[PDB]
Design an enzyme around this catalytic site. Sequence first.
Site, short mmCIF file in Angstrom:
data_model
loop_
_atom_site.label_atom_id
_atom_site.label_comp_id
_atom_site.label_asym_id
_atom_site.label_seq_id
_atom_site.Cartn_x
_atom_site.Cartn_y
_atom_site.Cartn_z
N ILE A 1 0.79 -1.23 0.00
CA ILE A 1 0.00 0.00 0.00
C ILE A 1 0.83 1.29 0.00
CG2 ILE A 1 -2.05 -1.02 1.02
CD1 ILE A 1 -1.02 -0.15 3.74
N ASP B 1 4.90 16.01 11.41
CA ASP B 1 4.34 15.93 10.07
C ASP B 1 2.87 15.58 10.14
OD1 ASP B 1 4.05 15.94 7.37
OD2 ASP B 1 5.20 14.12 6.98
C1 LIG Z 1 2.37 4.57 16.79
C2 LIG Z 1 2.97 5.32 15.59
C3 LIG Z 1 3.80 4.42 14.67
S1 LIG Z 1 4.46 5.34 13.22
O1 LIG Z 1 5.68 4.63 12.81
O2 LIG Z 1 4.62 6.73 13.66
N1 LIG Z 1 3.25 5.16 12.16
C4 LIG Z 1 2.92 4.03 11.49
C5 LIG Z 1 3.66 2.85 11.68
C6 LIG Z 1 3.31 1.68 10.99
C7 LIG Z 1 2.21 1.69 10.11
F1 LIG Z 1 1.87 0.56 9.45
C8 LIG Z 1 1.46 2.87 9.92
C9 LIG Z 1 0.32 2.88 9.01
C10 LIG Z 1 -0.90 2.28 9.43
C11 LIG Z 1 -2.05 2.28 8.54
C12 LIG Z 1 -3.27 1.69 8.93
N2 LIG Z 1 -4.32 1.71 8.09
C13 LIG Z 1 -4.14 2.30 6.90
N3 LIG Z 1 -5.22 2.31 6.06
C14 LIG Z 1 -5.27 2.88 4.72
C15 LIG Z 1 -4.72 4.32 4.68
C16 LIG Z 1 -4.95 5.02 3.34
O3 LIG Z 1 -3.99 6.05 3.15
N4 LIG Z 1 -3.01 2.88 6.45
C17 LIG Z 1 -1.94 2.87 7.28
N5 LIG Z 1 -0.68 3.46 6.92
C18 LIG Z 1 -0.59 4.08 5.59
C19 LIG Z 1 0.42 3.48 7.74
O4 LIG Z 1 1.48 4.00 7.37
C20 LIG Z 1 1.82 4.04 10.61
F2 LIG Z 1 1.11 5.17 10.43
#
Ligand SMILES: CCCS(=O)(=O)Nc1ccc(F)c(-c2cc3cnc(NCCCO)nc3n(C)c2=O)c1F
Length: 267
Positions: free
Chosen positions: A16, A129
Site C-alpha cells: 500500500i 508531520d
Molecule cells: C504509533 C505510531 C507508529 S508510526 O511509525 O509513527 N506510524 C505508522 C507505523 C506503521 C504503520 F503501518 C502505519 C500505518 C498504518 C495504517 C493503517 N491503516 C491504513 N489504512 C489505509 C490508509 C490510506 O492512506 N493505512 C496505514 N498506513 C498508511 C500506515 O502508514 C503508521 F502510520
Amino acid sequence: DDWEIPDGQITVGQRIGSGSFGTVYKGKWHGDVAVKMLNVTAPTPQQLQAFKNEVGVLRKTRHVNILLFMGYSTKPQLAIVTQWCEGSSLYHHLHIIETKFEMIKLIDIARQTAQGMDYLHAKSIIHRDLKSNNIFLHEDLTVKIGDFGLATVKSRWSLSGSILWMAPEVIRMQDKNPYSFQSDVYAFGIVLYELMTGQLPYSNINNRDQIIFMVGRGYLSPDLSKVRSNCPKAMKRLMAECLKKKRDERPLFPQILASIELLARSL
Ligand SMILES: CCCS(=O)(=O)Nc1ccc(F)c(-c2cc3cnc(NCCCO)nc3n(C)c2=O)c1F
C-alpha cells in the site's frame, strides 16, 4: 512484556505505502494489521538500538485517537506493526474521492484530530508531520493519527509533499529545532482549512518554490475567505488563530480543544 514479534508470525500481504523511509504492507497477525518495514537493507548495531528507542516512544501512546502500536519486529527486516484501519485517510477523502462530509462531521473530525494531538503533546510527543495524509478515518467515524514516531531515526539516518502544512518558522530552516508544539498547531490549522474548504491551500500557484519562499517570509497565507458558506464564524476565527505567522501567538491544544468543543455545542 516487551513487544518484539518473532520471525514467521507476521504474514505480509498486499502493498500500500511507497517511498524511501519504510514500505507499508497490510499484514495479518492476530487479525488484520498494518506493517511498516523500514527497507534499510541490513543495519549496524547502533542503529538497532536507535530503532528500539523509537519504539520506546511509540509504546508511550495509548489513546483512541492515536494509531495503535501493537508491536515491532527486527528479524526479517526492521518494521513496526500497527492496527489496520478499514477505510481511507482524510487526505484521500478530501482531495481524491471528493467525499462530501456533513458540517457536523467535519467539526468532529477536526475535534478528534485535536483530541489525539492534545494527547500526543501531554505525553511530550511532537508529531512534526501532521497532515490530512496522516489522519485515518477508521470505519469512517473514528480519527486515528499516525506517522508521528521515529523522527530520531531520520535526522541521524541516510519534507516535500508536506510543505503546505509546514509552519513558517519550519519552512525557513532557521536554527537547530524549529519544531514545537506550536508548529503542530499550525499544521492542525491547515487541516482545519482542508476540512472547511475541501481544498488544499494555494491551489493557484504552480511554482512550488515561491510557495516555500513566500510562506517563509509571511507574504503568503491561507485564504480564509473560502471557508464554505456555513462554517461557523468562530471556526474561521480559530483557524486564523492556529495559523498565526508568529508562532508565539498560536494557541495550544488544550485550548484549541475547548474552542471546538464549544462551537460544537452551539449548532
Ligand atoms: C504509533 C505510531 C507508529 S508510526 O511509525 O509513527 N506510524 C505508522 C507505523 C506503521 C504503520 F503501518 C502505519 C500505518 C498504518 C495504517 C493503517 N491503516 C491504513 N489504512 C489505509 C490508509 C490510506 O492512506 N493505512 C496505514 N498506513 C498508511 C500506515 O502508514 C503508521 F502510520
